[PDB]
Amino acid sequence: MITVIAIAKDGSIVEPKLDEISFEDYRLIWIDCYDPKDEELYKLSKKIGISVSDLQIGLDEQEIPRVEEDEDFYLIIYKAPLFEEDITTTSLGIYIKNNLLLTIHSDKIKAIGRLHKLISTKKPRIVFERGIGFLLYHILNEITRSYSRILMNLEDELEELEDKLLAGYDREVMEKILGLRKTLVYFHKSLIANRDVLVLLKRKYLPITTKEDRENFEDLYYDTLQLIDMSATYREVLTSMMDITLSLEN
Amino acid sequence: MITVIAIAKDGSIVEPKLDEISFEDYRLIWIDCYDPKDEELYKLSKKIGISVSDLQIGLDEQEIPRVEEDEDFYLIIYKAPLFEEDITTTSLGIYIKNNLLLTIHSDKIKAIGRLHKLISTKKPRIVFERGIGFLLYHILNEITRSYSRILMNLEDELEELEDKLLAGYDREVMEKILGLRKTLVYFHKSLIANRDVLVLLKRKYLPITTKEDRENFEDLYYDTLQLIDMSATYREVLTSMMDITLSLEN
Ligand SMILES: [Mg+2]
Ligand SMILES: [Mg+2]
Ligand SMILES: [Mg+2]
């Protein structure tokens, strides 16, 4: 059971990377902590003044998306897609403590690795000095893009499947239909939960959020809403096709 | 071997029936003409009063994206992803005459469905009044999003390809490699040609675009550059894997 315990750190102007650190030298900080060994986990607690119990939360990929508010910090449970023999969702914890943003998760969140890969491929130029409603914002924006993307390929799958119905009565069809129903269930439930996290973020006045960031989450809120309607529409599609392979046999 | 010839007719506030319509009954009208039988096309020129020749620009899918200036109208050629067993890109003309945005394409364009479908579900009236410096960008955006969807997707095939080389040579892999090169080559060329179109729209003051459209095309310009970068990044990766497939055997 390879457990990576990968941690990815960032900072002020511009283009930093580090581990055992000050972060008073930095405008903001993104520590992406990926699925830590029990030893590197405390390594983090020591560091950021965020306790492991408080942290162990954002590590439970079954945690319901939400926002918990300041003790020393802010917690946002968010849902990201989880890609496996069947696609699913999974929960990233995100803790914002003053100038530090942490992502903490059990499964890799492709949205994160993209920024990371991008971020390491990205020049000194791009301005995050707006950040940490901003950073958080992109993190959700990206995860969203993940959803948006999967839904786009799913609508792709629905199209092939529709002509594959000309075969009918098919063992494989019902099995793939449902598999797709499954993902669609995970999403709809998650984008709605995430929608409910977005709801607060586009509205609630927060130290972490500025108006400009608050502007974003309304976009992201309505985008997510886009994704929720679709999840449901693809669902409607699925049951209808489910109606066909039933009439064809079972 | 049909010519699918689907005339979609949309106008504010939100409804159908071309080949009787009175302009200036609406803010704007969106006519999408997909792969018309020239019976249906001639009718279209007649109604919109663009030279039947000038519309034929639009149906040429080899056309290099660009912006061309008035003969009684505006014209944008743009490269959008094209789907098959293997993916490439295909040109659509977009003509803007007064309040009429006409999107004309010989090949299906994934993005235009996604607006025609969105619109179907999308609510009516107030306010699309932002329309048609806006309407243009959205199509352009949805297209760009077509590309972005497939890159992040193609990226998957790359990760999945890295393993297949543990299986070593795989003339299969090599062809799959040449396949994803083929796709990428079209994207890169296309995103280049799109890019400039957007640099034009992002800069040049135009009757069809407003100040806000141009900022909106600037965003679109940015991601286009990302996509080119990814496309760049990805061909890179496929040059290596190929070199690899080759150090196996051949
Ligand atoms: Mg078929
Ligand atoms: Mg691997
Ligand atoms: Mg494998």
Short mmCIF file of C-alpha atoms and ligand atoms in Angstrom, two decimals:
data_model
loop_
_atom_site.label_atom_id
_atom_site.label_comp_id
_atom_site.label_asym_id
_atom_site.label_seq_id
_atom_site.Cartn_x
_atom_site.Cartn_y
_atom_site.Cartn_z
CA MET A 1 0.00 0.00 0.00
CA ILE A 2 2.10 2.88 -1.26
CA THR A 3 1.22 5.88 0.88
CA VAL A 4 2.80 8.97 -0.60
CA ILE A 5 2.81 11.46 2.27
CA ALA A 6 3.54 14.11 -0.36
CA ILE A 7 3.45 17.75 0.76
CA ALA A 8 3.57 20.72 -1.67
CA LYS A 9 4.40 24.22 -0.36
CA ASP A 10 4.32 27.78 -1.79
CA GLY A 11 4.71 31.50 -0.93
CA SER A 12 5.25 35.25 -1.55
CA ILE A 13 6.58 37.20 -4.52
CA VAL A 14 7.34 35.08 -6.22
CA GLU A 15 7.74 31.35 -7.10
CA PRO A 16 8.90 29.72 -3.73
CA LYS A 17 9.01 26.09 -2.48
CA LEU A 18 9.97 24.78 0.98
CA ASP A 19 9.09 22.53 3.98
CA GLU A 20 10.20 23.45 7.50
CA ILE A 21 9.44 27.10 7.21
CA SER A 22 8.63 30.53 8.62
CA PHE A 23 5.81 31.77 6.38
CA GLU A 24 5.98 35.21 7.88
CA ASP A 25 8.18 35.84 4.85
CA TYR A 26 5.26 35.12 2.57
CA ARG A 27 2.14 36.82 1.28
CA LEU A 28 0.17 33.58 1.44
CA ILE A 29 1.03 29.88 1.75
CA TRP A 30 -0.41 26.83 0.06
CA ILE A 31 0.68 23.58 1.65
CA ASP A 32 -0.78 20.69 -0.25
CA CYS A 33 -0.60 17.76 2.08
CA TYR A 34 -1.39 14.54 0.33
CA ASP A 35 -2.37 11.45 2.28
CA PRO A 36 0.35 11.69 5.00
CA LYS A 37 1.99 8.87 6.94
CA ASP A 38 0.98 9.12 10.60
CA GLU A 39 4.48 10.51 11.24
CA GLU A 40 4.46 13.34 8.63
CA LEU A 41 0.99 14.28 9.82
CA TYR A 42 2.14 15.48 13.24
CA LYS A 43 5.06 17.05 11.40
CA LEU A 44 2.34 19.35 10.13
CA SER A 45 0.55 19.93 13.44
CA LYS A 46 3.80 21.08 14.97
CA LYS A 47 4.22 23.48 12.05
CA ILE A 48 0.98 25.39 11.51
CA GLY A 49 -0.58 25.38 14.96
CA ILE A 50 -3.41 23.33 13.51
CA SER A 51 -4.04 20.28 15.70
CA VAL A 52 -4.29 16.75 14.31
CA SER A 53 -7.86 16.25 15.55
CA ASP A 54 -8.83 19.51 13.84
CA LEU A 55 -6.73 18.29 10.91
CA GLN A 56 -7.83 14.65 10.93
CA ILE A 57 -11.19 16.06 9.88
CA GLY A 58 -10.08 17.31 6.47
CA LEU A 59 -8.50 13.90 6.09
CA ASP A 60 -11.81 12.04 6.23
CA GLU A 61 -12.78 11.82 2.61
CA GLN A 62 -16.29 10.97 3.80
CA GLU A 63 -16.68 14.35 5.56
CA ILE A 64 -19.72 16.39 4.46
CA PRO A 65 -18.76 19.61 2.64
CA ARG A 66 -19.13 22.53 4.97
CA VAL A 67 -17.41 25.45 6.57
CA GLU A 68 -16.28 25.38 10.18
CA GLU A 69 -15.16 28.74 11.49
CA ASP A 70 -12.25 30.23 13.34
CA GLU A 71 -10.66 28.62 16.29
CA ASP A 72 -7.15 29.32 15.04
CA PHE A 73 -8.33 28.86 11.46
CA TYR A 74 -11.07 28.13 8.89
CA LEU A 75 -12.14 24.74 7.56
CA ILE A 76 -13.81 24.06 4.21
CA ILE A 77 -14.83 20.53 3.44
CA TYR A 78 -15.21 20.29 -0.31
CA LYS A 79 -16.09 17.44 -2.66
CA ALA A 80 -13.90 16.57 -5.59
CA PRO A 81 -14.34 13.78 -8.11
CA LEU A 82 -12.58 10.48 -7.39
CA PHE A 83 -11.58 8.45 -10.40
CA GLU A 84 -11.47 4.66 -10.10
CA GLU A 85 -12.82 1.47 -11.67
CA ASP A 86 -15.93 3.58 -11.32
CA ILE A 87 -15.76 7.35 -10.88
CA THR A 88 -16.80 8.77 -7.52
CA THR A 89 -16.26 11.82 -5.34
CA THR A 90 -13.94 12.42 -2.39
CA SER A 91 -13.56 15.15 0.27
CA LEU A 92 -10.62 17.54 0.42
CA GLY A 93 -10.17 19.47 3.62
CA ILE A 94 -9.02 23.05 3.16
CA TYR A 95 -7.78 25.04 6.11
CA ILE A 96 -7.11 28.76 5.89
CA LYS A 97 -5.14 30.07 8.81
CA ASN A 98 -4.34 33.74 8.35
CA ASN A 99 -1.80 33.78 5.52
CA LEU A 100 -1.66 29.99 5.15
CA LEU A 101 -3.88 27.83 2.92
CA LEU A 102 -3.68 24.07 3.34
CA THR A 103 -5.15 21.34 1.22
CA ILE A 104 -5.36 17.98 2.95
CA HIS A 105 -6.74 14.78 1.39
CA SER A 106 -6.64 10.96 1.23
CA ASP A 107 -7.12 10.53 -2.51
CA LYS A 108 -5.32 12.61 -5.08
CA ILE A 109 -7.54 15.46 -6.21
CA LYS A 110 -6.66 15.95 -9.86
CA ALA A 111 -7.63 19.58 -9.52
CA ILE A 112 -4.76 20.05 -7.07
CA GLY A 113 -2.12 18.24 -9.09
CA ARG A 114 -3.04 20.44 -12.04
CA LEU A 115 -2.31 23.67 -10.20
CA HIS A 116 0.78 22.00 -8.78
CA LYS A 117 1.96 20.83 -12.19
CA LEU A 118 0.86 24.13 -13.65
CA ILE A 119 2.19 26.04 -10.67
CA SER A 120 5.62 24.49 -11.10
CA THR A 121 5.36 25.07 -14.87
CA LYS A 122 4.08 28.62 -14.35
CA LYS A 123 6.30 31.70 -14.52
CA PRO A 124 6.93 34.23 -11.70
CA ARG A 125 4.42 36.56 -13.37
CA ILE A 126 0.87 35.40 -12.51
CA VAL A 127 -0.44 37.46 -9.58
CA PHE A 128 -1.79 35.62 -6.54
CA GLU A 129 -1.11 38.65 -4.34
CA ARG A 130 -4.91 38.93 -4.49
CA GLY A 131 -4.90 35.58 -2.86
CA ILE A 132 -6.33 33.29 -0.25
CA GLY A 133 -9.80 33.96 -1.06
CA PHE A 134 -8.31 33.77 -4.47
CA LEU A 135 -6.26 30.66 -4.06
CA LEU A 136 -9.10 28.89 -2.37
CA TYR A 137 -11.21 30.18 -5.20
CA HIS A 138 -9.13 28.58 -7.91
CA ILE A 139 -9.02 25.36 -5.97
CA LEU A 140 -12.81 25.16 -6.04
CA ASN A 141 -12.96 26.55 -9.53
CA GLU A 142 -10.62 23.75 -10.61
CA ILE A 143 -12.36 20.93 -8.77
CA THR A 144 -15.48 22.25 -10.42
CA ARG A 145 -13.76 22.05 -13.78
CA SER A 146 -13.08 18.43 -12.86
CA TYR A 147 -16.77 17.88 -12.38
CA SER A 148 -17.66 19.92 -15.44
CA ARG A 149 -15.22 17.80 -17.37
CA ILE A 150 -16.48 14.40 -16.22
CA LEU A 151 -20.05 15.49 -16.96
CA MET A 152 -18.93 16.50 -20.46
CA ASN A 153 -17.50 12.98 -21.13
CA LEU A 154 -20.47 11.43 -19.45
CA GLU A 155 -22.81 13.18 -21.87
CA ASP A 156 -20.40 11.68 -24.37
CA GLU A 157 -21.00 8.22 -22.89
CA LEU A 158 -24.76 8.72 -22.89
CA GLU A 159 -24.64 9.34 -26.64
CA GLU A 160 -22.78 6.14 -27.50
CA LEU A 161 -25.00 4.19 -25.11
CA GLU A 162 -28.13 5.48 -26.85
CA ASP A 163 -27.16 3.82 -30.13
CA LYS A 164 -25.86 0.80 -28.20
CA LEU A 165 -29.50 0.45 -27.17
CA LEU A 166 -30.26 -0.78 -30.68
CA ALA A 167 -28.82 -4.06 -29.39
CA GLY A 168 -31.16 -4.09 -26.40
CA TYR A 169 -31.64 -6.77 -23.74
CA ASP A 170 -27.99 -6.36 -22.96
CA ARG A 171 -26.11 -7.43 -19.86
CA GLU A 172 -23.38 -4.88 -20.45
CA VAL A 173 -25.74 -1.94 -20.93
CA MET A 174 -27.60 -2.15 -17.62
CA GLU A 175 -24.25 -2.58 -15.88
CA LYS A 176 -22.71 0.49 -17.49
CA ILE A 177 -25.93 2.47 -17.17
CA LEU A 178 -25.92 1.95 -13.44
CA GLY A 179 -22.21 2.52 -13.09
CA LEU A 180 -23.03 5.90 -14.67
CA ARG A 181 -26.01 6.31 -12.38
CA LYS A 182 -23.57 5.74 -9.55
CA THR A 183 -21.20 8.52 -10.55
CA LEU A 184 -24.21 10.77 -11.25
CA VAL A 185 -25.42 10.07 -7.71
CA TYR A 186 -22.07 10.87 -6.13
CA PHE A 187 -21.84 14.14 -8.12
CA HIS A 188 -25.35 15.39 -7.69
CA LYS A 189 -25.01 14.76 -3.98
CA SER A 190 -21.58 16.40 -3.92
CA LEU A 191 -22.05 19.43 -6.20
CA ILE A 192 -25.11 20.14 -4.06
CA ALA A 193 -23.08 19.88 -0.88
CA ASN A 194 -20.34 21.92 -2.56
CA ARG A 195 -23.10 24.21 -3.82
CA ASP A 196 -24.01 24.60 -0.17
CA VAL A 197 -20.42 25.49 0.69
CA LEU A 198 -20.37 27.91 -2.27
CA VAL A 199 -23.65 29.37 -1.03
CA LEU A 200 -21.96 30.60 2.12
CA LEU A 201 -18.75 31.67 0.35
CA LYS A 202 -20.38 33.97 -2.21
CA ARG A 203 -22.32 35.67 0.57
CA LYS A 204 -20.86 35.52 4.06
CA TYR A 205 -18.54 38.42 4.88
CA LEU A 206 -15.29 36.73 5.88
CA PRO A 207 -11.74 37.68 6.85
CA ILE A 208 -10.66 35.06 4.37
CA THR A 209 -12.96 36.44 1.65
CA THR A 210 -12.79 39.85 0.01
CA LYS A 211 -15.61 41.22 -2.16
CA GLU A 212 -13.68 40.37 -5.31
CA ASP A 213 -13.32 36.75 -4.15
CA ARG A 214 -16.95 36.82 -3.00
CA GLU A 215 -17.73 37.86 -6.59
CA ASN A 216 -16.06 34.70 -7.88
CA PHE A 217 -17.98 32.23 -5.74
CA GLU A 218 -21.27 33.48 -7.19
CA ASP A 219 -19.89 32.54 -10.61
CA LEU A 220 -18.69 29.27 -9.15
CA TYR A 221 -22.04 28.89 -7.36
CA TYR A 222 -23.94 29.32 -10.64
CA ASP A 223 -21.48 27.13 -12.53
CA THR A 224 -21.99 24.45 -9.97
CA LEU A 225 -25.74 25.03 -10.39
CA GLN A 226 -25.06 24.34 -14.10
CA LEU A 227 -23.46 21.09 -13.08
CA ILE A 228 -26.28 20.16 -10.70
CA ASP A 229 -28.97 20.59 -13.36
CA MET A 230 -26.89 18.49 -15.75
CA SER A 231 -26.21 15.81 -13.18
CA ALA A 232 -29.96 15.55 -12.82
CA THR A 233 -30.66 15.76 -16.54
CA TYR A 234 -28.17 12.97 -17.28
CA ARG A 235 -29.86 11.11 -14.46
CA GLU A 236 -33.26 11.48 -16.17
CA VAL A 237 -31.56 10.20 -19.30
CA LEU A 238 -30.15 7.19 -17.48
CA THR A 239 -33.48 6.01 -16.03
CA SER A 240 -35.14 6.34 -19.42
CA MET A 241 -32.49 4.13 -20.99
CA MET A 242 -32.87 1.97 -17.92
CA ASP A 243 -36.50 1.80 -19.00
CA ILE A 244 -35.44 0.40 -22.36
CA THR A 245 -33.15 -2.47 -21.26
CA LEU A 246 -35.93 -3.43 -18.87
CA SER A 247 -38.48 -3.61 -21.68
CA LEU A 248 -35.88 -5.48 -23.75
CA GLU A 249 -35.24 -7.94 -20.88
CA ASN A 250 -34.59 -8.83 -17.19
CA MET B 1 -24.66 10.27 -47.36
CA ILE B 2 -27.11 12.89 -46.13
CA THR B 3 -26.25 16.55 -45.70
CA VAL B 4 -27.64 16.96 -42.18
CA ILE B 5 -28.65 20.63 -42.71
CA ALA B 6 -30.01 21.67 -39.31
CA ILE B 7 -31.16 25.27 -39.08
CA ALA B 8 -31.45 26.39 -35.49
CA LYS B 9 -33.04 29.83 -35.07
CA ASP B 10 -32.80 31.71 -31.78
CA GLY B 11 -33.66 35.29 -30.82
CA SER B 12 -34.38 37.45 -27.78
CA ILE B 13 -36.63 36.92 -26.22
CA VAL B 14 -36.08 33.18 -26.72
CA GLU B 15 -37.87 31.40 -29.62
CA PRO B 16 -37.98 29.65 -33.18
CA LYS B 17 -39.30 29.86 -36.79
CA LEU B 18 -36.92 31.16 -39.41
CA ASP B 19 -38.08 31.79 -43.00
CA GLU B 20 -40.69 33.94 -41.53
CA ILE B 21 -39.17 36.36 -39.05
CA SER B 22 -39.19 40.10 -38.65
CA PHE B 23 -35.89 41.48 -37.47
CA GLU B 24 -35.92 44.41 -35.08
CA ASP B 25 -38.53 42.44 -33.20
CA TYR B 26 -35.57 41.36 -31.12
CA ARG B 27 -32.33 42.50 -29.50
CA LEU B 28 -30.46 39.75 -31.32
CA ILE B 29 -31.00 36.48 -33.18
CA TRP B 30 -28.72 33.47 -33.25
CA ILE B 31 -28.91 31.37 -36.39
CA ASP B 32 -26.79 28.24 -36.37
CA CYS B 33 -26.59 26.55 -39.71
CA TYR B 34 -25.17 23.05 -39.62
CA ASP B 35 -24.14 21.45 -42.92
CA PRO B 36 -26.93 22.90 -45.14
CA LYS B 37 -28.26 21.49 -48.44
CA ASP B 38 -27.77 24.45 -50.70
CA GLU B 39 -31.50 24.61 -51.13
CA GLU B 40 -31.60 25.52 -47.41
CA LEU B 41 -28.49 27.67 -47.72
CA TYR B 42 -29.69 29.87 -50.60
CA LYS B 43 -32.87 30.53 -48.63
CA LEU B 44 -30.60 31.61 -45.78
CA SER B 45 -28.52 34.06 -47.79
CA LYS B 46 -31.75 35.42 -49.20
CA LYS B 47 -33.22 36.02 -45.78
CA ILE B 48 -30.02 37.39 -44.25
CA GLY B 49 -28.88 39.03 -47.45
CA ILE B 50 -25.32 37.82 -47.40
CA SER B 51 -23.93 36.82 -50.81
CA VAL B 52 -24.46 33.06 -51.16
CA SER B 53 -20.73 32.96 -51.94
CA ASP B 54 -19.81 34.83 -48.74
CA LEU B 55 -21.63 32.24 -46.63
CA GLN B 56 -19.69 29.47 -48.33
CA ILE B 57 -16.64 30.77 -46.50
CA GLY B 58 -18.35 29.56 -43.34
CA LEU B 59 -18.92 26.00 -44.55
CA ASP B 60 -15.26 25.51 -45.44
CA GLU B 61 -13.80 23.55 -42.56
CA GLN B 62 -10.25 23.95 -43.85
CA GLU B 63 -10.57 27.75 -43.45
CA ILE B 64 -7.92 29.40 -41.29
CA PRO B 65 -9.51 31.19 -38.36
CA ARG B 66 -9.36 34.93 -38.79
CA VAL B 67 -11.42 38.06 -38.60
CA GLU B 68 -12.45 39.63 -41.88
CA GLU B 69 -14.03 43.06 -42.26
CA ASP B 70 -17.29 44.29 -43.67
CA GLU B 71 -18.87 43.56 -46.83
CA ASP B 72 -22.25 44.30 -45.20
CA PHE B 73 -21.30 42.14 -42.15
CA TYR B 74 -18.64 40.71 -39.82
CA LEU B 75 -16.95 37.33 -40.21
CA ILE B 76 -15.08 35.15 -37.75
CA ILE B 77 -13.59 31.87 -38.79
CA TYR B 78 -12.72 29.74 -35.81
CA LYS B 79 -11.28 26.29 -35.17
CA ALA B 80 -13.32 24.04 -32.93
CA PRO B 81 -12.53 20.47 -31.85
CA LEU B 82 -13.95 17.77 -34.15
CA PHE B 83 -14.72 14.31 -32.89
CA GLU B 84 -14.29 10.98 -34.66
CA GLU B 85 -12.60 7.69 -33.94
CA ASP B 86 -9.72 10.17 -33.72
CA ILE B 87 -9.98 13.87 -32.85
CA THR B 88 -9.02 16.88 -34.97
CA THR B 89 -10.35 20.42 -35.44
CA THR B 90 -12.75 21.93 -37.93
CA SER B 91 -13.61 25.48 -38.98
CA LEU B 92 -16.83 27.36 -38.52
CA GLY B 93 -17.73 30.73 -39.90
CA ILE B 94 -19.43 33.20 -37.62
CA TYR B 95 -21.06 36.13 -39.36
CA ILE B 96 -22.34 39.17 -37.51
CA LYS B 97 -24.86 41.35 -39.29
CA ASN B 98 -26.41 44.09 -37.18
CA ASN B 99 -28.14 42.16 -34.44
CA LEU B 100 -27.71 38.77 -36.16
CA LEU B 101 -25.02 36.34 -35.00
CA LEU B 102 -24.94 33.48 -37.50
CA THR B 103 -22.77 30.46 -36.73
CA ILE B 104 -22.23 28.37 -39.80
CA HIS B 105 -20.49 25.00 -39.81
CA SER B 106 -20.20 21.99 -42.10
CA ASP B 107 -19.12 19.72 -39.24
CA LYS B 108 -20.96 19.34 -35.97
CA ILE B 109 -19.47 21.61 -33.34
CA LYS B 110 -19.82 20.30 -29.83
CA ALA B 111 -20.01 23.77 -28.37
CA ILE B 112 -23.01 25.00 -30.33
CA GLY B 113 -25.12 22.08 -29.30
CA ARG B 114 -24.19 22.99 -25.72
CA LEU B 115 -25.67 26.46 -26.18
CA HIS B 116 -28.68 25.21 -28.14
CA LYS B 117 -29.24 22.72 -25.35
CA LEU B 118 -28.46 25.24 -22.62
CA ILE B 119 -30.81 27.76 -24.18
CA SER B 120 -33.52 25.13 -24.36
CA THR B 121 -33.22 24.59 -20.60
CA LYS B 122 -32.06 28.15 -19.87
CA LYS B 123 -34.73 30.62 -18.77
CA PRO B 124 -36.19 33.47 -20.88
CA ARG B 125 -35.89 37.26 -21.10
CA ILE B 126 -34.04 39.49 -18.69
CA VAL B 127 -31.34 39.84 -19.33
CA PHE B 128 -29.55 38.48 -22.37
CA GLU B 129 -29.42 42.17 -23.17
CA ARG B 130 -25.65 41.88 -22.74
CA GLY B 131 -25.95 40.10 -26.08
CA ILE B 132 -23.66 39.74 -29.08
CA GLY B 133 -20.48 41.18 -28.09
CA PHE B 134 -21.25 38.64 -25.46
CA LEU B 135 -22.93 35.98 -27.53
CA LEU B 136 -19.84 35.73 -29.66
CA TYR B 137 -17.46 35.20 -26.78
CA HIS B 138 -19.61 32.46 -25.31
CA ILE B 139 -19.56 30.33 -28.39
CA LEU B 140 -15.84 31.09 -28.58
CA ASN B 141 -15.66 30.20 -24.93
CA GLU B 142 -17.61 26.98 -25.24
CA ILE B 143 -15.38 26.07 -28.13
CA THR B 144 -12.29 26.87 -26.12
CA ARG B 145 -13.79 24.73 -23.36
CA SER B 146 -14.16 21.92 -25.88
CA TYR B 147 -10.41 22.07 -26.36
CA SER B 148 -9.67 22.36 -22.65
CA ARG B 149 -11.86 19.39 -21.90
CA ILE B 150 -10.02 17.17 -24.34
CA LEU B 151 -6.52 18.24 -23.34
CA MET B 152 -7.08 17.42 -19.70
CA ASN B 153 -8.58 14.21 -21.11
CA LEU B 154 -5.78 13.52 -23.55
CA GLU B 155 -3.53 14.08 -20.55
CA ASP B 156 -5.12 11.01 -19.00
CA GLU B 157 -4.26 8.86 -21.98
CA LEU B 158 -0.68 10.00 -21.44
CA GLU B 159 -0.51 8.80 -17.84
CA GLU B 160 -2.21 5.56 -18.99
CA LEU B 161 0.34 5.38 -21.80
CA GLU B 162 3.35 5.57 -19.47
CA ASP B 163 2.47 2.14 -18.08
CA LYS B 164 1.82 0.50 -21.45
CA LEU B 165 5.55 0.99 -22.00
CA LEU B 166 6.25 -1.28 -19.02
CA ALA B 167 4.76 -3.76 -21.47
CA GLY B 168 7.46 -2.39 -23.76
CA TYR B 169 7.37 -2.00 -27.52
CA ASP B 170 3.59 -2.22 -28.39
CA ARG B 171 3.41 -1.08 -31.99
CA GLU B 172 -0.06 -0.42 -30.62
CA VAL B 173 1.38 2.18 -28.22
CA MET B 174 3.43 3.72 -31.02
CA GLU B 175 0.32 4.16 -33.16
CA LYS B 176 -1.68 5.42 -30.20
CA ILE B 177 1.24 7.81 -29.79
CA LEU B 178 1.14 8.91 -33.41
CA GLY B 179 -2.62 9.14 -32.89
CA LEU B 180 -2.47 11.55 -29.96
CA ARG B 181 0.19 13.44 -31.89
CA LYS B 182 -2.22 13.80 -34.78
CA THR B 183 -4.86 15.13 -32.45
CA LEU B 184 -2.42 17.51 -30.71
CA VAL B 185 -0.95 18.82 -33.96
CA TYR B 186 -4.45 19.99 -35.02
CA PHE B 187 -5.16 21.52 -31.64
CA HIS B 188 -1.90 23.35 -31.53
CA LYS B 189 -2.23 24.78 -35.01
CA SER B 190 -5.89 25.53 -34.23
CA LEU B 191 -5.33 27.13 -30.85
CA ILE B 192 -2.65 29.19 -32.50
CA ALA B 193 -5.05 30.40 -35.20
CA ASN B 194 -7.88 30.87 -32.68
CA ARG B 195 -5.47 32.70 -30.40
CA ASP B 196 -4.79 35.45 -32.88
CA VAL B 197 -8.49 35.80 -33.68
CA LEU B 198 -8.96 36.41 -29.95
CA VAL B 199 -6.00 38.79 -29.82
CA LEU B 200 -7.85 40.77 -32.52
CA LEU B 201 -11.15 40.74 -30.71
CA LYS B 202 -9.33 41.32 -27.43
CA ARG B 203 -7.73 44.50 -28.77
CA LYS B 204 -9.38 46.07 -31.79
CA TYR B 205 -12.30 48.39 -31.04
CA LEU B 206 -15.27 46.96 -32.97
CA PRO B 207 -18.96 47.79 -33.48
CA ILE B 208 -19.81 44.21 -32.60
CA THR B 209 -17.74 44.13 -29.40
CA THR B 210 -17.90 46.36 -26.33
CA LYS B 211 -15.24 47.17 -23.73
CA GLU B 212 -16.46 44.24 -21.63
CA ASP B 213 -16.47 41.84 -24.53
CA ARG B 214 -12.78 42.57 -25.08
CA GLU B 215 -11.84 41.91 -21.45
CA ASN B 216 -13.90 38.72 -21.85
CA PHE B 217 -11.90 37.80 -24.93
CA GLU B 218 -8.74 38.51 -22.94
CA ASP B 219 -9.63 35.83 -20.43
CA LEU B 220 -10.41 33.63 -23.38
CA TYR B 221 -7.07 34.64 -24.88
CA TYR B 222 -5.34 33.55 -21.63
CA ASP B 223 -6.76 30.05 -21.50
CA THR B 224 -6.13 29.62 -25.21
CA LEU B 225 -2.49 30.29 -24.41
CA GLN B 226 -2.73 27.78 -21.55
CA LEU B 227 -4.15 25.21 -23.97
CA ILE B 228 -1.44 25.88 -26.45
CA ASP B 229 0.99 25.44 -23.54
CA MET B 230 -0.59 22.16 -22.50
CA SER B 231 -0.71 21.13 -26.14
CA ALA B 232 2.92 22.17 -26.25
CA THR B 233 3.67 20.37 -23.00
CA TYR B 234 1.86 17.27 -24.29
CA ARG B 235 3.54 16.94 -27.66
CA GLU B 236 6.75 17.20 -25.64
CA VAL B 237 5.69 14.20 -23.58
CA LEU B 238 4.70 12.29 -26.73
CA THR B 239 8.07 13.02 -28.35
CA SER B 240 9.68 11.30 -25.37
CA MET B 241 7.35 8.35 -25.21
CA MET B 242 7.89 7.83 -28.92
CA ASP B 243 11.63 7.97 -28.53
CA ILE B 244 10.97 5.38 -25.84
CA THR B 245 8.73 3.14 -27.92
CA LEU B 246 11.67 3.26 -30.31
CA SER B 247 14.37 2.31 -27.79
CA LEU B 248 12.27 -0.79 -27.09
CA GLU B 249 12.42 -2.12 -30.64
CA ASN B 250 11.68 -1.41 -34.35
MG MG C 1 -23.14 3.63 -32.82
MG MG C 2 1.55 5.77 -13.14
MG MG C 3 -2.62 0.67 -14.44
#
